[PDB]
Amino acid sequence: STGSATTTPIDSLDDAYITPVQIGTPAQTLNLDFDTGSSDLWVFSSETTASEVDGQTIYTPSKSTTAKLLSGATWSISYGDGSSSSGDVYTDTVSVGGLTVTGQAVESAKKVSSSFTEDSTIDGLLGLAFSTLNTVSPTQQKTFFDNAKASLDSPVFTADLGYHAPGTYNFGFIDTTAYTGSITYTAVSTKQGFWEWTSTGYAVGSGTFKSTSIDGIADTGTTLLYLPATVVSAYWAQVSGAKSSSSVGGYVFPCSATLPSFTFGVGSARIVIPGDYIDFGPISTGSSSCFGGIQSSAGIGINIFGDVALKAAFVVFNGATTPTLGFASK
Question: Does this entry carry the keyword Transferase?
């Protein structure tokens, strides 16, 4: 089997992407944030504290003939941005782009943090990291991909995120029309539960490539590119007036700037992030200070190849017995 679903930016900055997901019988379609940095499929629901729901579409298990309470199971998750959610668990039928999994754990939120409430466009998350990170207790649950894997034509999914445009998540096949040149594959460590890999270096604009190992995670659920302070400083030094602002929470730059590109290495291959992808616009409405899309990972504890990086590539998440990651230009 295979599946193919379009993923759509939630706003004009590509802050996140939502993908329609069918849950239950008859189908209830919710727009979920596919997150290769976590491993829980959770949804706003009929159980979510009413004051914490503001415009989201909810899953109502009592209206699904295939829903079953997973008795005794609870979940609770905290994300890198400080947001969180928690609740109980149902199993139900879940379909993405025509690919169906029966008996998928659907984590029903009883509580969500303010950032979730305030974002009416995201109805929940669909985790695509390794199932070892799943938070369900006392019986850990599998991700949608893990459950689908054996049925897939090939044990892979691909992320093809758009810049200010829709893109695609495919399951079970590699669309050879969706990229240019060849795909370069690179080793993955699953030791921390992430799609963790080592970039071979970077360049800023038209500058020379610096060969240096940068360990990080491929994370579709993180907006920006978070890299070591040395790398980030070298980038922003090429933008007149750019500075790190403790009050704003990162590097800012004059909105009048033209940003240089940023290149990262994948083995001997190179992925180029155009400068425009690094512009996250005014820090507040009407400001002439703009927020940068490359930020320091210092104090996160891990480097993160978030959407800024991933949307410059066609990315293969190869879930074979020995997982790997592939990157192609597009």
Answer: no
What single DSSP character describes residue 257?
Answer: P
Domains identified in the chain and CATH numbers: 5-174 (2.40.70.10), 175-330 (2.40.70.10)
What is the spatial distance between Cα 158 and Cα 181, in angstroms, rounded to a whole number?
16
Which residue in this structure is represented by tokens 């989201």? 56
| Amino acid identity for residue 127 in this structure | G
Residue type, 59: Y
Identify the experimental approach: X-ray
d(CA 6, CA 245): 36
Concatenated DSSP letters of 131-194: GGG---BSS----HHHHHGGGSSSSEEEEE--SSS-EEEEES---TTSSSS-PEEEE-B-TTSS
**Taking the alpha carbons of 11, 179, 306, 90 in that order, is the dihedral positive or negative?**
positive
d(CA 128, CA 53): 25
For the annotated catalytic residues, the residue numbers are: 35, 199
Q: Could you tell me if 227 and 213 are in contact, meaning their C-beta atoms sit under 8 angstroms apart?
A: no
